[model samples]
Target chain A: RMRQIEDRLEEILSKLYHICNELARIRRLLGER
Target chain B: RMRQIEDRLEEILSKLYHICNELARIRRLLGER
Candidate 1:
């Protein structure tokens, strides 16, 4: 999991991390509901 | 939430729904842990 994350982030660059964060936010929001 | 997802999708056009999937998968994995 960690490897694929860092690996994909390479081809995609920093935006992958941004998506990661955005996803985290949505999960938190959804979990609240 | 919906608008932000759509609005950014085309500007970052290639990145959205794909990110949505990847993000969702990661959340599931982490949640299981």
Candidate 2:
């Protein structure tokens, strides 16, 4: 019961958080024009 | 002891894939000029 997810959850969430921040940065740049 | 990540992984990955696709689409549109 539950083997793979425990190991990968942190990695996945980290990637997800980074992408979310990047999208926000891009949005701000676009809006600045 | 993994409970939350298993269910949310699919949803997270699906959203990630969609954003990647959208970015590619935007890049292509920008390049067409």
Candidate 3:
């Protein structure tokens, strides 16, 4: 049978990437303003 | 299906836990010094 998908790892990584990008943007903004 | 083969998920979770713990320790050290 097919194994359960590792979809949750993908989800977690996606969210982590989003947060990291958001943090970078915020840092840039803070540096500018 | 047979055994679910959650080994990968467990590995991912364990790695994440270690990373999170390390991050927390770094934050605490930064706060202290």
Candidate 4:
């Protein structure tokens, strides 16, 4: 049987990565405006 | 004298930021090698 993902670190990392990407996109758009 | 669980989002966000920063640092160090 396969083991489940423990620690939830990846989930946390993914969320943070998305947040930073969104922030960067927003800054870029604002800079263009 | 109110809600005890005030959604520790900031604390979690800070930890996530640190992790991302550390990962970037490691990648840069490896790239230099």
Candidate 5:
């Protein structure tokens, strides 16, 4: 159903956002290195 | 359907893998810097 897909997409987007933030943090650490 | 979810999951996994590779490359560049 559309609802199910929407929920899954939201979860995936949230996780992806978290992952992107983590990568950003890593880049910052690299800059400091 | 399960097939649709599986396909989406595959795409997500592939993209995540690509992001990881890009991060690895960045880390390598940092190491070389």
Candidate 6:
């Protein structure tokens, strides 16, 4: 169903977003040096 | 369906893997300094 796919995609998007933030944090850390 | 979920998860995993590689490369570049 569309709902199932939408829900799954939403969860995946959040996971992607979280990892992206982690990467951004790493970038900032490297810049501090 | 189970197959659908598995396929979606696989796609997300690949995306996560690619980002992780990018982050690792960034870390390595910082080490050169």
Please report how far candidate 1 places residue B25 from its true position, in Å: 21
* TM-scores vs. true structure, each candidate: 0.34, 0.45, 0.44, 0.45, 0.50, 0.48
Candidate that scores best on DockQ? 4
Best by TM-score: 5
Ranking by lDDT: 6, 1, 5, 2, 4, 3
Positional deviation of residue B9's Cα in model 3 after best superposition, in angstroms = 29
- For model 1, which pairs clash? none
Model 2 residue B5 lDDT score:
46
- The i-RMS of every model, in angstroms, reads 10.6, 17.3, 18.5, 10.0, 17.7, 17.6
Clashes of 2: 0
Positional deviation of residue A4's Cα in model 5 after best superposition, in angstroms: 0.3
- Cα lDDT tens digits, model 6, A4-32, are 55555556656776876675565455455
- Model 6 ranges off by over 4 Å: B1-33
Error of 1 at A9 (Å): 7.2
Off by over 4 Å in 4: A1-15, A19-33, B1-7
Model 4 alpha-carbon miss at residue B29, Å: 0.6
Error of 1 at B32 (Å): 36
Worst 10 residues of 2 chain A by lDDT: A1-10
Q: lDDT (0-100) at residue A31 of candidate 6? A: 50
Clash pairs for candidate 4: none
Error of 1 at A33 (Å): 0.4
Across B1-33, the per-residue lDDT of candidate 6 in tens digits comes to 655555555566667778766655554555544
DockQ of each: 0.05, 0.04, 0.02, 0.10, 0.03, 0.04
Error of 1 at B10 (Å): 25
Native contacts kept, each candidate: 0.00, 0.03, 0.00, 0.12, 0.00, 0.03
- lDDT tens digits, residues A1-33, model 3? 111223443455566656655655554554554
Model 2, TM vs. native: 0.45
lDDT of 1 by residue, B1-33 (tens): 866654454446356656656766675575566
Winner of 1 and 4 under DockQ: 4
Clashing pairs in 5: none
- The lDDT per prediction is 0.60, 0.55, 0.50, 0.54, 0.59, 0.60
